[PDB]
Amino acid sequence: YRPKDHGWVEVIVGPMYSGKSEELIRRIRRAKIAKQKIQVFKPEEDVVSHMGEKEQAVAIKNSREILKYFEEDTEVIAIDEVQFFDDEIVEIVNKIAESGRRVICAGLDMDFRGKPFGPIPELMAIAEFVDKIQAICVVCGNPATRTQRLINGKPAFYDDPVMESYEARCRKCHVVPQ
Amino acid sequence: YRPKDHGWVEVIVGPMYSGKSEELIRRIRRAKIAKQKIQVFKPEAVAIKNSREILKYFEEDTEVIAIDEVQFFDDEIVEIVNKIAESGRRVICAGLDMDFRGKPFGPIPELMAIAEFVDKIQAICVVCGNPATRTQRLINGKPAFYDDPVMESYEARCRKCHVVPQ
Numbered sequence A: 001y002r003p004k005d006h007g008w009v010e011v012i013v014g015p016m017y018s019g020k021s022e023e024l025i026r027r028i029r030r031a032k033i034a035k036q037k038i039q040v041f042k043p044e045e046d047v048v049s050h051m052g053e054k055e056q057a058v059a060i061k062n063s064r065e066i067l068k069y070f071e072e073d074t075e076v077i078a079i080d081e082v083q084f085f086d087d088e089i090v091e092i093v094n095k096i097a098e099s100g101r102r103v104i105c106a107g108l109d110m111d112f113r114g115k116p117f118g119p120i121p122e123l124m125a126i127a128e129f130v131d132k133i134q135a136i137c138v139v140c141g142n143p144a145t146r147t148q149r150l151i152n153g154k155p156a157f158y159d160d161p162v163m164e165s166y167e168a169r170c171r172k173c174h175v176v177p178q
Numbered sequence B: 001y002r003p004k005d006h007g008w009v010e011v012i013v014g015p016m017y018s019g020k021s022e023e024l025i026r027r028i029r030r031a032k033i034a035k036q037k038i039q040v041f042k043p044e045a046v047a048i049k050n051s052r053e054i055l056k057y058f059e060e061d062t063e064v065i066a067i068d069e070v071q072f073f074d075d076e077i078v079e080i081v082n083k084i085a086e087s088g089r090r091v092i093c094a095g096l097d098m099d100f101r102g103k104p105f106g107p108i109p110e111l112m113a114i115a116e117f118v119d120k121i122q123a124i125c126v127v128c129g130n131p132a133t134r135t136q137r138l139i140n141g142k143p144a145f146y147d148d149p150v151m152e153s154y155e156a157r158c159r160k161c162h163v164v165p166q
């Protein structure tokens, strides 16, 4: 599988602190050891993980800029914090994969309300590889799959726009008052 | 993990022939061996129409709810499934992730987004032998065009081998 000049899209998703950046960095370093030219992208320049490690990346204001900074020489494209890019990133990523290159996307699957977040849903449907990873619930210790938003130390309301903190929780402990 | 009365949603996706039904059926037999009451639904073992009709047939006695061919249900399915999981029960969904054009199929994107477990499985490409991730629609043995409405056949293919003229 994965023969040369055959492209695909792989996605890494989960709540905050699930380890998306850590994993993205892991795959980035492996590609480099494999001697494959790779370009890393992040929104508005290093991709950093809460656990320590970091990798050089090119910050970009929007999805379109990917094609602008894209060098035909690169074999692997890595994109972090994907939940913030507009929906055009989907066709852009699909196009890169169709061109015979590998695209690695990492990002939140849901927002603090537990609702499908941005492009990730569509990216998961079209990607050849999907890895949904879990964090640990700071409340009970079981695997956390939701990001809990807190204001003054208490759960934020559903219809609450954007003193405030975030933490990973499981479905049971995640609280979203509406 | 996933102890008593802790519910969740698990999804099984992939192209035709990837093995979704086989996997779903396997999980249903396992739950039965675990002595768990299970109810099965389809877009029409309990065939049904829309998604709001699941709540109707739903017996509070059941611990596991299986939904096959999920990509055919309306978007309400997402809410219902989440609700069943929120009530402490297990929901197993199986469905195509993309249509023949390779476009996200129905509520699949949103279900994968909210699901705790996501398994994307592959078939074998009848053209080259590599893992197949797409469903190829054929009319008279030729690739169906991008804008073709509903001899016709389907087969699993690799990304490279999938052909969708536009």
Ligand SMILES: Nc1ncnc2c1ncn2[C@@H]1O[C@H](COP(=O)(O)OP(=O)(O)O)[C@@H](O)[C@H]1O
Binding pocket: A014, A015, A016, A017, A018, A019, A020, A021, A022, A023, A048, A049, A050, A051, A134, A135, A136, A137, A138, A144, A167, A168
């Ligand atoms: N609740 C938590 N669950 C798991 N890891 C946590 C948690 N809180 C802090 N961490 C630490 O933070 C790291 C988060 O990885 P990171 O890649 O930055 O996450 P993500 O990009 O998914 O938000 C973990 O490897 C762990 O050492």
Ligand SMILES: Nc1ncnc2c1ncn2[C@@H]1O[C@H](COP(=O)(O)OP(=O)(O)O)[C@@H](O)[C@H]1O
Binding pocket: B014, B015, B016, B017, B018, B019, B020, B021, B022, B023, B122, B123, B124, B125, B126, B132, B155, B156
């Ligand atoms: N191209 C193919 N790739 C893989 N399996 C195939 C293919 N064509 C036929 N099969 C057979 O069909 C079975 C498909 O499983 P099934 O659960 O019916 O698929 P799905 O529900 O995903 O459409 C396989 O286990 C295999 O024996």
Ligand SMILES: [Zn+2]
Binding pocket: A137, A139, A140, A141, A142, A169, A170, A171, A172, A173, A174
């Ligand atoms: Zn918890």
Ligand SMILES: [Zn+2]
Binding pocket: B125, B126, B127, B128, B129, B130, B157, B158, B159, B160, B161
């Ligand atoms: Zn093929």
